[PDB]
Structures are given as C-alpha cells and as structure tokens.
C-alpha cells in the first residue's frame, strides 16, 4: 500500500494518499494515490 489519508485531493474512486507512489491506483494499506 501507499501513504494514509490527510493530503488535499479529490477520491477518484480510491481512496486519498498523502504522496504518489511509484504506482497508479493499487492501494492496500489506507488511502490511494488519487
């Protein structure tokens, strides 16, 4: 999984990460990477 919750974005459907990752939308912890 990515970064929790508490950045400022908009859900696209998957939860808000609080630093994009490496990824694009795979989230297995709290927020994704909108």
Same mark, same amino acid.
């Given at each position: 999984? &990515?970064?929790?919750?508490? =950045?400022?974005?908009?859900?696209?459907?998957?939860? %808000? &990460?609080?630093?994009? %990752?490496?990824? =694009?939308?795979?989230?297995?912890?709290? &927020?994704? %990477? %909108?």
């Amino acid at each position: 999984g &990515c970064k929790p919750k508490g =950045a400022p974005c908009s859900p696209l459907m998957y939860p %808000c &990460c609080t630093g994009p %990752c490496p990824g =694009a939308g795979w989230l297995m912890k709290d &927020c994704l %990477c %909108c």
